[PDB]
Short mmCIF file of C-alpha atoms and ligand atoms in Angstrom, two decimals:
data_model
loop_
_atom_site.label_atom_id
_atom_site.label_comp_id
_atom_site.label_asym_id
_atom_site.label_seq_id
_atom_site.Cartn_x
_atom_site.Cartn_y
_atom_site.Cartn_z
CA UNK M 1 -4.72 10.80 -10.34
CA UNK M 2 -1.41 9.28 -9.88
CA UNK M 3 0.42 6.23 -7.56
CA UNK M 4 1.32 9.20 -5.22
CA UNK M 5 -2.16 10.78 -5.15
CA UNK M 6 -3.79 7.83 -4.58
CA UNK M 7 -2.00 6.27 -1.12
CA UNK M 8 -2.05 10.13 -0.19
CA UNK M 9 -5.98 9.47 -0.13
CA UNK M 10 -5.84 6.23 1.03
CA UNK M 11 -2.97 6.34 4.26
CA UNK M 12 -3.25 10.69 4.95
CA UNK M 13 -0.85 12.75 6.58
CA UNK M 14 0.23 12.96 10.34
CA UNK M 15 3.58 14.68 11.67
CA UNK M 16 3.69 12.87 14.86
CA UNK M 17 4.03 9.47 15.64
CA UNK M 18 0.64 7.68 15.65
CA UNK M 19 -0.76 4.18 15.51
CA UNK M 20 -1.93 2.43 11.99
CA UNK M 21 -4.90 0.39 11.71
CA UNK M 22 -2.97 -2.68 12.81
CA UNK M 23 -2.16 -0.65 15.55
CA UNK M 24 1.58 -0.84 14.56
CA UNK M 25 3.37 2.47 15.40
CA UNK M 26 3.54 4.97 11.83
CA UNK M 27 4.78 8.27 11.04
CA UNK M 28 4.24 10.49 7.54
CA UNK M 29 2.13 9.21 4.46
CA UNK M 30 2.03 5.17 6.43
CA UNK M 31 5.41 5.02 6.77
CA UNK M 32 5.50 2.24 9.49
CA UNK M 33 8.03 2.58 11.55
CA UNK M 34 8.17 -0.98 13.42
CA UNK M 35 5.74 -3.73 14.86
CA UNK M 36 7.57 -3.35 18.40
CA UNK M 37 4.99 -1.95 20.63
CA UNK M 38 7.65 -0.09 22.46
CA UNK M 39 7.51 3.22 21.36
CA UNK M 40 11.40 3.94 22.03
CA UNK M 41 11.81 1.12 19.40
CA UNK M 42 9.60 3.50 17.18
CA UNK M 43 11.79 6.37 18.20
CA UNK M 44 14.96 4.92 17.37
CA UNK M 45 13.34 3.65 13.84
CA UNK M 46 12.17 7.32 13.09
CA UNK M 47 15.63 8.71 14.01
CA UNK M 48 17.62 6.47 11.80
CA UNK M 49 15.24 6.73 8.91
CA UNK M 50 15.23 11.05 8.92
CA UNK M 51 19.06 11.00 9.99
CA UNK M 52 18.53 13.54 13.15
CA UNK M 53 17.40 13.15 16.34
CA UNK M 54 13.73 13.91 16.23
CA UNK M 55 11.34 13.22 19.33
CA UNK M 56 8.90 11.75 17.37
CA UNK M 57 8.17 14.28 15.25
CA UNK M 58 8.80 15.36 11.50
CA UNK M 59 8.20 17.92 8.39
CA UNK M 60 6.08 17.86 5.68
CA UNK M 61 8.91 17.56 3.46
CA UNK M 62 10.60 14.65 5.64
CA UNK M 63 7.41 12.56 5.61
CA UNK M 64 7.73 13.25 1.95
CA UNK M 65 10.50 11.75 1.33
CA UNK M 66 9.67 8.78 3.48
CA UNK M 67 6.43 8.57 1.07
CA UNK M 68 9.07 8.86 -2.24
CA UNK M 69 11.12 6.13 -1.05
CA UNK M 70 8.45 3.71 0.29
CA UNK M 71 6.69 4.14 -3.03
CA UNK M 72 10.31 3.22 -4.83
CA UNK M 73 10.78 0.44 -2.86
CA UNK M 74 6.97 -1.26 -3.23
CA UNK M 75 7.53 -1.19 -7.19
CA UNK M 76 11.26 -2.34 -7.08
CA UNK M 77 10.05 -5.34 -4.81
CA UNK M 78 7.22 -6.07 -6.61
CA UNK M 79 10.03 -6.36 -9.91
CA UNK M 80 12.23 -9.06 -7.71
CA UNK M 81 8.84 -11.00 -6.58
CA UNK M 82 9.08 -13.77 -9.57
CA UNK M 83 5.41 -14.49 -8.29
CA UNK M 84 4.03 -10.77 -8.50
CA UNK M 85 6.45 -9.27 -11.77
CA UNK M 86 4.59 -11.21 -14.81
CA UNK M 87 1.03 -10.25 -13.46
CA UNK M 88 2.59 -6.63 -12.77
CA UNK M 89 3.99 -6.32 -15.86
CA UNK M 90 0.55 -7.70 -17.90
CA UNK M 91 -1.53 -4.87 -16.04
CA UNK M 92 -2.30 -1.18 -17.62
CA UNK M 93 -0.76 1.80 -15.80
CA UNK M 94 -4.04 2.08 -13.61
CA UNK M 95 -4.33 -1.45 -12.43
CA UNK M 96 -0.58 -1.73 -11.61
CA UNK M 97 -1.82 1.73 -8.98
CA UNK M 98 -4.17 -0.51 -7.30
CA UNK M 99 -0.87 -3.50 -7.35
CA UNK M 100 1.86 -0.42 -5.72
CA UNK M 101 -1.04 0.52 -2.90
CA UNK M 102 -1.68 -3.24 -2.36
CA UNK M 103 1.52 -4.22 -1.41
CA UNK M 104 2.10 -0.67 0.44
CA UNK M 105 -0.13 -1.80 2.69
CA UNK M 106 0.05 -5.18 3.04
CA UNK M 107 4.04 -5.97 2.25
CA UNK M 108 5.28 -8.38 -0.38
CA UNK M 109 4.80 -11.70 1.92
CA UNK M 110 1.44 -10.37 2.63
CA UNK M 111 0.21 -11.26 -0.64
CA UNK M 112 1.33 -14.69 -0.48
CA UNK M 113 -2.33 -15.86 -0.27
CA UNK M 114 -3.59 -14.47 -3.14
CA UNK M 115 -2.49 -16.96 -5.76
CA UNK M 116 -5.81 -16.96 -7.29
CA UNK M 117 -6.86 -13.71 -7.50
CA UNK M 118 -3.09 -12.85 -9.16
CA UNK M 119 -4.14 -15.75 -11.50
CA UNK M 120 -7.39 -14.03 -12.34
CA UNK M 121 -5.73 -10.81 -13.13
CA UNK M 122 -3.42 -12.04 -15.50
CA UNK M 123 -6.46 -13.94 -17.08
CA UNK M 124 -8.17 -10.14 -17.19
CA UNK M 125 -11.23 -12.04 -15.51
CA UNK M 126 -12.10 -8.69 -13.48
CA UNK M 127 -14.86 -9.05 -12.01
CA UNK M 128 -14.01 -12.83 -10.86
CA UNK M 129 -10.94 -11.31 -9.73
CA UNK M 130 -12.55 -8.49 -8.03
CA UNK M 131 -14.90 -11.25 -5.90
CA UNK M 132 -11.64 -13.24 -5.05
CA UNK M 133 -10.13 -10.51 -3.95
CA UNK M 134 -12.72 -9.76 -1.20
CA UNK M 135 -12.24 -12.98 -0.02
CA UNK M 136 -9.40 -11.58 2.41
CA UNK M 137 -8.51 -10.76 6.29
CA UNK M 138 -7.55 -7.56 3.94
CA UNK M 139 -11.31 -6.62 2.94
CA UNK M 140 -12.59 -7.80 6.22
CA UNK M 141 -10.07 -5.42 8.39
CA UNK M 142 -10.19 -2.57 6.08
CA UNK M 143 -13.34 -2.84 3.99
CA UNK M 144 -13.15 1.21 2.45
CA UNK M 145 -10.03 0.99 1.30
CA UNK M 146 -10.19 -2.26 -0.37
CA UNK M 147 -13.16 -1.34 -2.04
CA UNK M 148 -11.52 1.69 -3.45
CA UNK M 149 -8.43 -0.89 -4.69
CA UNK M 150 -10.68 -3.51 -5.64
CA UNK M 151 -12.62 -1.14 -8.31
CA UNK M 152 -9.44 0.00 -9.61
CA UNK M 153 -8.53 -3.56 -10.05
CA UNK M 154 -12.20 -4.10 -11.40
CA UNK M 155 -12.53 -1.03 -14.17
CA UNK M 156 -8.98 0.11 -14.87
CA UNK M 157 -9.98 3.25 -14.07
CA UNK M 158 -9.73 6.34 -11.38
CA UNK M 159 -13.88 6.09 -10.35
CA UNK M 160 -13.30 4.96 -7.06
CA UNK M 161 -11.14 8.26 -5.93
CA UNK M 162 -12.50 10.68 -7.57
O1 269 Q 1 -2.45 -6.18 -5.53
C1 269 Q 1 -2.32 -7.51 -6.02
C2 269 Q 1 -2.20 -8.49 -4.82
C3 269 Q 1 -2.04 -9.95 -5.26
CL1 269 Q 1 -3.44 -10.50 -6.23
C4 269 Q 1 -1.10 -7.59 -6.95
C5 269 Q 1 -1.30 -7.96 -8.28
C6 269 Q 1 -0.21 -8.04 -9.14
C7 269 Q 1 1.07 -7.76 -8.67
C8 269 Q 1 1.28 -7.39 -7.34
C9 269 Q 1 0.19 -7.31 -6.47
#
């Protein structure tokens, strides 16, 4: 299991334009395209992200490369957040997973909310943190997936995706 492996699980794979939980039009491996609900707005989006003219519609490969990029960028802002780098940067290689699909799916000002569960982590209070962490519009909306992340925050470990 790996970063890439793990929001693979956790977002899947569709070709064609579709609708996130949020309901927030998507394309690829959660690669949200805009929060317009016009879906010409989505269009547009999709075309100037692949660089062709696409009708809503993309390749494995292209959806992979969304997925490379959106990965990149959720680490590299995570780096500039002078809130989220010291906690980042305290974490193991597996917890700082469950940080990258965190702020995947929730954005950097998403977070903002969770000063005491980040406080926890750097602490290494895990199960504390874990219960804070459930405490959240996040678990509430999405309760599988933060239960996968949550455990991975928990145990430092891969359990939750087997
Ligand atoms: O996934 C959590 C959300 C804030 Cl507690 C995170 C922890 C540490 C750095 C960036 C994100």
């Amino acid at each position: 299991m790996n970063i890439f492996e793990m929001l693979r699980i956790d977002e899947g794979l569709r070709l064609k334009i579709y609708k996130d939980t949020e309901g927030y039009y998507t394309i690829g491996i959660g690669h949200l395209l805009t929060k317009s609900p016009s879906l010409n707005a989505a269009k547009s989006e999709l075309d100037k992200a692949i660089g062709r003219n696409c009708n809503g519609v993309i390749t494995k490969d292209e959806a992979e490369k969304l997925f490379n990029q959106d990965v990149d960028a959720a680490v590299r802002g995570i780096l500039r957040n002078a809130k989220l780098k010291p906690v980042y940067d305290s974490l193991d290689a597996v917890r700082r997973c469950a940080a990258i699909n965190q702020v995947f799916q929730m954005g950097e000002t998403g977070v903002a909310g969770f000063t005491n569960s980040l406080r926890m982590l750097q602490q290494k209070r895990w199960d504390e943190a874990a219960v804070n962490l459930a405490k959240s519009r996040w678990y509430n909306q999405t309760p599988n997936r933060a239960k996968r992340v949550i455990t991975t925050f928990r145990t430092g470990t891969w359990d939750a995706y087997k």
